[PDB]
Amino acid sequence: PKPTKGPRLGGSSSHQSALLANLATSLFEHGRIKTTEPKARALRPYAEKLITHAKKGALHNRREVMKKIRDKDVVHTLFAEIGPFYADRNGGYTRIIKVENRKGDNAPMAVIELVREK
Amino acid sequence: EFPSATAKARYVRVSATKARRVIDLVRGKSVEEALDILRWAPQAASEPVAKVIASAAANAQNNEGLDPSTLVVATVYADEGPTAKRIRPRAQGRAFRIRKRTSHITVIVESRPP
Amino acid sequence: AVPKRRMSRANTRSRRAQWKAEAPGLVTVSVAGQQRKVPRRLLKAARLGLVDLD
Amino acid sequence: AKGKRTFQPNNRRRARVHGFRLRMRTRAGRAIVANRRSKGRRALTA
RNA sequence: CAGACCACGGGAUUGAUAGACCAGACCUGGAAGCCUAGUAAUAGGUGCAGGGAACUGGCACUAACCGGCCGAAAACUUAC
RNA sequence: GAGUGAGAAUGCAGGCAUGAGUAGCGAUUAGGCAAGUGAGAACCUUGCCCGCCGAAAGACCAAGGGUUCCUGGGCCAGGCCAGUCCGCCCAGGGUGAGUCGGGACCUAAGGCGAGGCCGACAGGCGUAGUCGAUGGACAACGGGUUGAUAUUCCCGUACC
RNA sequence: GGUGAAAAGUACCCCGGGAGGGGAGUGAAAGAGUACCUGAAACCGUGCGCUUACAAUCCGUCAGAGCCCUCGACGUGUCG
RNA sequence: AAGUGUUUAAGGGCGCAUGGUGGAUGCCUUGGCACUGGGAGCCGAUGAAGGACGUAGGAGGCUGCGAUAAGCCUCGGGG
C-alpha cells in the first residue's frame, strides 16, 4: 500500500516489513492484537490487502499471501476461514480502537480487530 | 471556614516541579474531577498526586465524617524534599552531580456546599 | 556557549511557566451501570470494554 | 586501540614488590613498616 | 502536497476526509498453475499476463464516535 | 583578656539556585504479538514469530575479581526510564581429587645468602646453600548425577 | 553528635502495594514522631493585597494618582 | 456623530501570611588541647611492639580472650 511517509516503523525498512508481517500474522491468528497506535495504522492497509488476497480463492493469491506472511497455519486460516468470511464485505475488513497509553513510554496504543457483524 | 481534611505524602520520589506540573491541573477542582483528571493525565507524577488527593478525601469521609461529593481540592501544593546527591561520570573523567529530588505533596480538601 | 549571567528570577519564572501539562478533556461513558470519565479518543474503547477503568 | 591501563594486577608481584617480607628485608622498608604501625594503619604492607 | 511542535487547510454520517474494495491511469514487462517443444538449460500458448504505492472516479465496508471546554455589553458630556 | 566584627583572597566547607525540566540516557543486532504474574509491565515469565553473532556476541582455561554461583524472599537505594526483574539487597545453601592445577619433585632468569670479601657507619657484593615457573619429571578415562560440585561425587573399567 | 524526664518510639480505625499520611492515643510539648532540641539564610511552594501585556527599566531615589489595610476624630463618610 | 472611562493576567514584580528544604544560631557534650603534681621510666628468644585467624547459643564491628579461647586457678574487696 501507500509507503510510510516518515521514518519507517521498526527503525528501518526491512524491520518495518518484518514487523508488519508479524503483526499481520498475529492479527490473523488472534483476531484482536493490541499494538502501538502508529503500528496499528500502518498494519490496517497491509492486513486488509492480505485479506483481499485471501478473499479470492486462487493458488496465485495463496502464494502472494505466503510471500508476505510466511506462517502456514495463519495462511490456511486466512484462505479457509477469513476468505469466505468476507465473501460479501467489500473492504474495511478490520477495525482500530484507540485504547489507553502504555505506562512505560506513554505510547499511544490501539487494538486492531477483524470485523465480525456479518 | 468549610470543614476540611489534610493529607501529606512526604518524601515522594518525584521532583517537586514535576509534582506541581500535575497539581496545577487539579488545584481548586472537585475531588471527583481532580481524580479523573489525574487518572487520565499522562504525567507519571500524577499517581502520587492522585493518591494524596484520594487519601485526603478518605480522611474527610472517615476521620471527619464528611460527604465525599461535597469535597474539592482546596489547597494542594508540592514542596521540595530531601535531595540525594549522585555522581554521573562523564568525558575526560569529570564527575557531574545528579540530583535525585523528592517532594512533599500536601493536599487539603474542603467540604463546600453544592 | 554558556549562560553569561544568572537569569533573573522573573525571567526564569516566566519561561518556566510555559512548561505545563494540558488538562485532558473528559467525556462521560456508561460502564457497568456507574458513569466514568474518559478521553473522547478512548470513548469507543470504553464502550467496547477495552479500557481498564480502575 | 592500545588502551592498557597502568595498574595491571598481579597478586604474586604485588606481594613480592610491596609485601611484608620485602619491607622487612631492608632498613628503609622496616622503617616504613614501623612508621605505618605508628600511624596506626591496619594494612602495614601488601 | 500543511507541518519541527504549534499553526494553517479540509472532513467529521445531512460524510468520500483517510484506509480498504472496485475500476481506471501509470510503472514493470509477460505471474502462478497447466499444456506443449524439448535427453536439459530453457522456450512457446493460456495472456498488453501478473504484480503493484502516491494520480483519477466510484463505493460508507473500516474509522471519523450516544461529547467535552470555552464563548455575548457601567455608563456619561456634547451636538443632532 | 580577646580566635572581637568579611562582601570580595579565580578564598575553604556545607546547603542551594542559574543554565533547565534543558543536553544526554553509552554504538555500528530489532523487536512484535499472545498469554501469565503483579497494585503497577515496552523492559519480568512462558509460547510463537522476527532479527543479530556464529574464528563469536559460542564453549573452556589462566590472570584478575571474591561469593557476584544456587534456592527462597525484597523492591525504599543502585540499573542512566520503570521494573514484579537484576551481577542490587536479605537469609540459607553451595566448591568433595592418590591421577586435574600447584606444594610435599627439579631446576632457569632472578632473589636471598652461613661463613666470607669489600666498605668510616649505613651498608655493596657474593661462595656453599636456598628459594624461584613461564620450563623438566610425574598415575584416569567414558557415562550419569544435583538447585548449585565434578577427570573430585556415583556407575564401569584403569592406573600410583 | 543533640527525640523525650522516661520509649511512654503511634497493640485495635481509615486511604495506600509500599512510602506517607489522617484518626485515635503517649507526652508538658508531637509548634519533640527514631527523617526527631533550637530551626537562620540561601533556595522552592501555596494563599491573599496592589501592580503590571504601547513598553527601552545599575532595577533605585524624590514627587506621586489610584487601590488595599490599620490607628484616632467626629459618631453622616470625610479629615488627620 | 464626536469625545470621556472601566474592567483581562497567559505570566511577572513587590508586601504580607503560611509552609517545605537546609542546618546556621543559642544552649549543651561522649571528645580534644594545654598544662600541674606524682608513679613508671623500659618491653623482648621464658618469644616483644604489633598483628592474622579464631573464641559467646545465636550474623558482623568494637572489647576481652587464645583450641583451657568475653575465658581457667589462687588470694583479697564487695555485697
String of DSSP letters for D1-24:
-----S----HHHHHHHHSHHHHH
Distance D39 CA to F9 C1' (A): 34
Cβ neighbours, 10 Å, residue B12: 23
A117 part of contact set with chain C, CB < 8 Å: no
Give the separation between CA B23 and CA C21, rounded to whole angstroms.
Answer: 10
- Residue pair A66/A53 in contact by the 8 Å Cβ criterion: no
User: Residue C21: is it exposed, middle or buried by C-beta count within 10 angstroms (0-12/13-18/19+)?
Assistant: middle
Nearest Cα to Cα of residue B109 among B32, B38, B47, B46: B32
- Residue pair B75/B108 in contact by the 8 Å Cβ criterion: yes
Q: Count the domains in chain A.
A: 1
What is the sign, positive or negative, of the torsion defined by CA atoms of D16, D17, D18, D21? positive
Chain F footprint bases within 7 A of protein beta carbons: 15-22, 26, 30-35, 40-43, 49-51, 63-65, 76-82, 112-113, 122-124
* Phi, psi (degrees; rounded to nearest 5) at C12: -55, -50
Determination approach: cryo-EM
Chain E footprint bases within 7 A of protein beta carbons: 1, 3, 18-22, 31-33, 50-54, 59, 61-69
For chain C, give the number of residues.
54
Nearest Cα to Cα of residue A35 among A85, A83, A84, A101: A101
* Phi, psi (degrees; rounded to nearest 5) at B108: -135, 110
CA torsion B7→B9→B10→B15, rounded to 10°?
A: -130
| CATH number of the structural domain spanning residue D17 | 1.10.287.3980
3-state secondary structure chain B: CCCEEEEEEEEECCCHHHHHHHHCCCCCCEHHHHHHHHHHCCCCCHHHHHHHHHHHHHHHHHCCCCCHHHEEEEEEEEEECCCEEEEEECHHHCEEEEEECCEEEEEEEEECCC
**Chains touching chain B at 3 or more Cβ pairs under 8 angstroms?**
A, C
Buried b / exposed e over B83-112, threshold 16 CB at 10 Å, is eeeeeeeeeeeeeeeeeebbbbbbbbbbbe
Q: Which residue has the cell 552531580?
A: B97
Distance B4 CA to E17 C1' (A): 51
CB-strand contact B101/H, under 7 Å: no
| Strand, coil or helix: A113 | strand
Mutant choice from B15, B17, B29, B40 vs C, greatest count of C C-beta within 10 A: B40
Query: Domain range holding D44?
Result: 1-46
C52 part of contact set with chain A, CB < 8 Å: yes
Q: Count the domains in chain D.
A: 1
Distance A35 CA to F44 C1' (A): 19
The reported resolution of this PDB entry, expressed in Å, is 2.8
- Residue pair B104/B12 in contact by the 8 Å Cβ criterion: yes
- Residue pair B3/B59 in contact by the 8 Å Cβ criterion: no
Give the separation between CA A28 and CA A65, rounded to whole angstroms.
Answer: 12
| Strand, coil or helix: C28 | strand
A106 part of contact set with chain B, CB < 8 Å: yes
Give the separation between CA B84 and CA D37, rounded to whole angstroms.
Answer: 38
- Residue pair B32/B50 in contact by the 8 Å Cβ criterion: no
CB-strand contact A100/F, under 7 Å: no
* Angle made by CA atoms D1, D4, D5, in degrees to the nearest 5: 135
Give the separation between CA A109 and CA D1, rounded to whole angstroms.
Answer: 45
Up-side HSE of residue C7: CA atoms within 13 Å toward CB? 10
Nucleotide nearest C15 (Cα, C1'): H11
Cβ neighbours, 10 Å, residue A52: 17
- Cα A118 from chain centroid (whole Å): 19
Q: Which residue has the cell 474539592?
A: B72
Q: Rounded to a whole number, what is the distance in Å from the CA of A70 to chain C's nearest CA?
A: 30
One-letter identity of residue B28: G
CB-strand contact C20/H, under 7 Å: yes
The pairing of strands B103-111 and B71-80 is antiparallel
Q: How far apart, in Å, are the Cα atoms of A84 and each of A10, A34, A80, B7, D7?
A: 32, 25, 7, 61, 73
What is the sign, positive or negative, of the torsion defined by CA atoms of B56, B57, B60, B61? negative
Which residue ranges make up each domain of chain B? 2-112
The class level of CATH for B2-112 reads alpha beta
Q: Specify the DSSP element, H or E, that contains A99.
A: strand A94-99
- Residue pair C37/C29 in contact by the 8 Å Cβ criterion: yes
A4 part of contact set with chain B, CB < 8 Å: no
User: Residue A19: is it exposed, middle or buried by C-beta count within 10 angstroms (0-12/13-18/19+)?
Assistant: buried
Give the separation between CA B7 and CA B23, rounded to whole angstroms.
Answer: 14
Q: Specify the DSSP element, H or E, that contains D39.
A: helix D27-39
Chain H footprint bases within 7 A of protein beta carbons: 10-14, 19-22, 49-52
Query: Domain range holding A33?
Result: 1-118
A109 part of contact set with chain C, CB < 8 Å: no
| Strand, coil or helix: A91 | coil
Q: Kindly calculate the radius of gyration of chain D based on its CA atoms and give it in whole angstroms.
A: 14
